[PDB]
């Protein structure tokens, strides 16, 4: 019960910190996508054109770079969140850097799911919606860059997690003892073990009807690793065909010798 209390207090701390760290939450995204509050819809080139006035070189490059710029803002928010996870800033600084390098894209994809449905994605802080079909229409090699993310999101969203759940799950992901090059695995696994028990208790309290949710969520962590792998490869291709396209230097730091 004092442990129970501690675990609930940890869940609460992380939820509070998540809210502070991430302006566009799942609750906020769901309210927008279901009308409880509509986004300008971009479904083709003409609507993209009309969209540029209403909300905020070649189109496919502009959209891809838009995705990168949004990722950069997510890295910032995730880094702030990570600093609030009890124990994190007390780790070896080399290890903190390794945990962020490998963790940030997995979190990006997790949280991107909140903004997605099977037909498209919220953009521009919820002021626009870009259709999946439109993102598939872009020229090679950009035609498919979002499809792995959509596929993940549709499956992930079927678990009906809320932000209080997500706050604990993303903490678990960052505190992964199996990242390459970690110097002190045991303190990381110790923190993750607390987070995992917090997660288990949260899901039991918050999703009593979902009998195997904890196990299902652990599997998603593994799935996240593959989208990242596939994304980095996709970037290799693009770095080949598109030598003139500037990449974002923060992302270059993250991607350098990643996998």
């Amino acid at each position: 019960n004092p442990e129970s209390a501690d675990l609930r207090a940890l869940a609460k701390h992380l939820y509070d910190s998540y809210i502070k760290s991430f302006p566009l939450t799942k609750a906020k995204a769901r309210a927008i996508l279901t009308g409880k509050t509509s986004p300008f819809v971009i479904y083709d080139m003409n609507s993209l054109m009309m969209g540029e006035d209403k909300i905020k070189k070649e189109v496919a490059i502009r959209i891809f770079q838009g995705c990168q710029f949004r990722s950069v803002e997510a890295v910032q928010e995730i880094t702030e969140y990570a600093k609030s996870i009890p124990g994190f800033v007390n780790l070896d600084l080399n290890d903190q850097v390794t945990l962020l390098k490998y963790g940030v894209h997995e979190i990006i994809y997790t949280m991107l799911a909140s903004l997605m449905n099977k037909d498209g994605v919220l953009i521009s802080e919820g002021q626009g919606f870009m259709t999946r079909e439109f993102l598939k229409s872009l020229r090679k090699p950009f035609g498919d860059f979002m499809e792995p993310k959509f596929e993940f999101a549709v499956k992930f969203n079927a678990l009906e997690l809320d932000d209080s759940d997500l706050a604990i799950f993303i903490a678990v992901i960052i505190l992964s003892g199996d990242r390459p090059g970690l110097l002190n695995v045991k303190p990381i696994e110790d923190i993750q073990d607390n987070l995992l028990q917090a997660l288990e208790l949260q899901l039991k309290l918050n999703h009593p009807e979902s009998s195997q949710l904890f196990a299902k969520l652990l599997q998603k962590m593994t799935d996240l690793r593959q989208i990242v792998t596939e994304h980095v490869q996709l970037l290799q291709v693009i770095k080949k065909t598109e030598t003139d396209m500037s990449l974002h230097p923060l992302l270059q730091e993250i991607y350098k010798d990643l996998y």
Partner: peptide
Amino acid sequence: XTHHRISDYXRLTXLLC
């Protein structure tokens, strides 16, 4: 603060530290 790979992580270190 400083760390072994800082010279390759100016921007990330800016955020973390």
